[PDB]
Symmetry: D2
Subunit: 241 residues, 4 copies
């Protein structure tokens, strides 16, 4: 933690470096996915050769060169680059950049959560009918779809509104910014969420990780209210330990 602030500024530059690849290529197009990754990898390693990078010790950078690929290929502006860092098992730094909006979300353990310099935080709201929730799950799941459909139906009925933007890292950043009350994505990878979670926690959010935090996981995050409720419902059709 002696160079936490140096890790942060490096995470931010890495996200921007790969975010520029997404920027220059938007609307023109998978070579982008690899070019963004190389750039991110280059920045991290030149600064910290010894660290390990994961995607696709005591310092593991979990990166997502392009979160929201399908949206990116179709032209839907909800996509980003995610750059998270974890010491041992503890996630300590997060950087998520939204190229199309030129919005850079970031945060470090105990240092706060920000978006382009402005401090952010999850919103205050108990009321479920006044709440907004984003969600997401795969098309060819490892788990039966019906389960996800049943969980959806239950929250959908109590919540004020639900949205499926198509990019976990962004969903995580909008919850941390106080736009959406909570989220719930299933069958996630560490690089999909690591950076976003750090930011969410620093913005004062709560979250339950189901499964191996660095393997395949499920995530239920948001303010106190939605987290407990999405979690309650989430365990009627599946198991949590």
């Amino acid at each position: 933690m002696e160079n936490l602030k140096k890790y942060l500024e490096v995470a931010k530059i890495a996200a921007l470096a790969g975010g520029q690849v997404l920027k220059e290529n938007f609307g023109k197009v998978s070579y982008v996915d690899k070019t963004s990754e190389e750039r991110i990898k280059e920045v991290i390693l030149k600064f910290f050769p010894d660290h390990e990078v994961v995607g696709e010790s005591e310092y593991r950078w979990f990166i997502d060169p392009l979160d929201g690929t399908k949206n990116y290929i179709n032209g839907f502006p909800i996509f980003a680059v995610s750059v998270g860092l974890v010491k041992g098992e503890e996630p300590i730094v997060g950087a998520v950049y939204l190229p199309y909006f030129d919005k850079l979300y970031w945060g470090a353990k105990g240092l706060g959560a920000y978006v382009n310099g402005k401090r952010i935080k999850v919103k205050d709201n108990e009321s479920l009918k006044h709440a907004g929730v984003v969600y997401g799950f795969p098309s060819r799941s490892r788990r039966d779809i019906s389960i996800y459909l049943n969980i959806f139906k239950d929250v959908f009925y109590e919540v004020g509104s639900m949205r499926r933007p198509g990019a976990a890292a962004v969903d995580l950043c909008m919850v941390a910014e106080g736009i959406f009350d909570g989220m719930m994505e299933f069958e996630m990878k560490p690089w999909d969420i690591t950076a976003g979670l750090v930011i969410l926690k620093e913005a004062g959010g709560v979250y339950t990780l189901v499964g191996e935090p660095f393997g395949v996981s499920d995530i239920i995050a948001g303010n106190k209210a939605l987290h407990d409720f999405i979690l309650q419902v989430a365990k009627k059709y599946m198991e949590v330990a």
Copy 2:
């Protein structure tokens, strides 16, 4: 209707009138906004055409949506719009939809084409389902939710991706713009889709309206491929006539 041109130009201005209310109030944590936007629109339309009828909540009928995507707008999510559509008798002839946050004005008129801020648009060519992008939306409902979950899962298994942005007028413009192959909206009002529908049609899109075009309806629109696919699936779980 020799004034199509004038009708179009008025629709656009009116959408800009209401959109201005939506943009300068965005972010300011009661929906006096919606009422004010509506007031500006009705006002513009009725100074140019005093005898035309304006619908939303007698040969020419203007269907207007002062605020498509209320939930998103309140929460701080960019996907919201204002729609202004003109119907002569029964035929939709002019459409204008404005995305204030993006300062994007989608417009079109019968036989004159579809446009977005000056550039001509059109639906995409692809007929491959696994590559297709689809947007959907059903309310939280008049009919049993199971029906929507059933139509969703099926399409979900075939298409490349599915999104729920939360504002039908925008879903229609993005389909018209060729970002999404198709859209799927259930239990709509005429002022939710009339404008976006004119636009979609001029972009070369195909669509199926279920129920009374000027009463509660369901809309399935997109390129040929997706419209044929979504419609066929829907017909397995619900009635269309």
Copy 3:
């Protein structure tokens, strides 16, 4: 009908600005623009008069920054101002590229997209920023403007020539620039901007014939007094 003239001015500017927006990066524009502006105005106030290249006059610039617009420089706007008798009371200046709408009305304050604005404070002249402008083929001798330019140049921190008076007035109003100096002006290029600047707590002096060819010196008290100080040394005033 005070709050009503303002809403119409805003919609009129937006209407004309939309034309500029659709064609940016390509006079049909200028013509089409004023066409939309006068049309919206006369639809809401058939008794009012429109002017712009009856106790209620609207001075409009369908496209301020024509040259910038043609080159692809983002500095350009639409200007819609209203005068009652001889007093500027309502103004709207829209900048299509930045999607920023500046508006104001006597007693109601100045705004830019729903945000209230005000001119800036100045303690040191060498910290001030000034925007200026004069024509290439001018009625006055360029020597006069060069003298005015130097004197002001040596005293302030910076001087900029953006190319759109209507936009210069607005930037002084928002407190980006301490003040401006624009010479050989027409009423439709500055009326809407003046209303906005004054409601932003600004000061200004018109030289010549308002609603005619004039000069304009505007900004916070400090720069206005200084720019006017210099001007008086090389030319006519009152």
Copy 4:
């Protein structure tokens, strides 16, 4: 190795631009400038430890942490970060970032000039009366008159003349085809080196009067305007 120098350059500009970006509007200055400078110099030296950084060997980087300082402090969006690479005495790499507009101009010798992954080129001109020129000079080492005379003669011939207040950005707008040319006096290497590479690869022409790596005056634009505003200059200050 040009390709690797260019990618690094873009990143360096972006990094320093981020500082400028998250501090724009917040009425300090030395802090932003210095913080931006430190981030740019760090990235460069990280990929090329042997290179030399300059501004305020066989491979020198001329960087401007914040071009358009006064504009930046005032809140006028015309400002940027300039990162240029020089091999020997020749400008070979250039990256100019405009944080506010989120536009990144870039180029490398023999590779072309771009803006956010968009190939750019100077505009074609015929009539001087249709030309647009950006100018600028310090408040100076030469008698203002000299510059005012040059400005005056050009002013009389072209359609328009603007003074945005940021050389780096100026050179990029000429490269993009917005302005036909620009004249700027009393320049430093870090102010124009990046823009120069970008301009030249956009098919532009420029003349450096003075010491390229010292204090200099720059005449740059397409062929037309460059020749024209070069004629006028040597009519008042006698370029070599």
